[PDB]
Design an enzyme around this catalytic site. Sequence first.
Site: not given
Length: 267
Positions: A46, A49, A107, A143
């Site tokens: 993550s 991001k 997240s 994801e």
Amino acid sequence: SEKLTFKTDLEKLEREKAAQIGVAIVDPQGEIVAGHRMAQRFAMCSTFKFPLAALVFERIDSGTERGDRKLSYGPDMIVEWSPATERFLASGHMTVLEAAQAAVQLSDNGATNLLLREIGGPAAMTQYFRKIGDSVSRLDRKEPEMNDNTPGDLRDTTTPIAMARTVAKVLYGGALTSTSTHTIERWLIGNQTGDATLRAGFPKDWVVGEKTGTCANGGRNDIGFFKAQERDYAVAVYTTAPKLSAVERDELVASVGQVITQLILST
Ligand SMILES: *C(=O)/C=C/N[C@@H](C(=O)O)[C@](C)(Cn1ccnn1)[SH](=O)=O
Ligand SMILES: C[C@](Cn1ccnn1)([C@@H](N)C(=O)O)[SH](O)O
């Protein structure tokens, strides 16, 4: 030397926690302050991001995207850990800005995939890395598959030094307008997922913002920036500790934060 203490203490954590710890700290111009396993590949999970939000704001800056654009979706968009995306599902959409904020501060994985679809997918993310001078970081999947962290798999990886320099470029190196830069920086400071990781190891008075990651096979990462003694820094921390509990991995990253603090304050 302060540098020897830094090395020794990181290796102590590696030994006692059976972990690998990748660290890069650079100054605003991307010059090396300190590192450990800095050219070693780790899964971004993550942490990517943050760069994704930068990509989005770059398009907003360039006028090829609007923050108020509504991105519509249905149940198929929902993936594991999508707190905001699930809340907004009935309404039928999230704006670009809502999705980016959720991706950075919660997240939210659904919101991440929603944005990836909008901006052109892993290919577009990777092209953005290349555009800002990062030849190392790469996004290949979305994801949740990107978090697989299979040993030796180069997909969806970065190195601590490459990512730290990317953070510096985005925040200090003029990659975004001052407005977009400020917006992302405030999101990073107000992030809701980093309380137990890197910033738990920094002094209370440092201004710090960061984005966490969690990977299969014991990955726990945190990248971001801090201001200490009136100097600005970019930092990337990637760790792998297959045998630790989730809470212990949080503690490990916070411990790395403490080691970083000692080095910075000694200078
Ligand atoms: C960014 O770091 C996202 C991580 N996603 C992981 C994780 O948080 O550990 C997920 C949610 C792990 N997972 C699978 C099933 N339940 N949790 S997934 O997106 O890889
Ligand atoms: C850890 C999360 C996702 N998460 C939270 C609870 N279960 N999964 C992960 N995406 C990360 O940022 O490392 S987040 O809340 O920090």
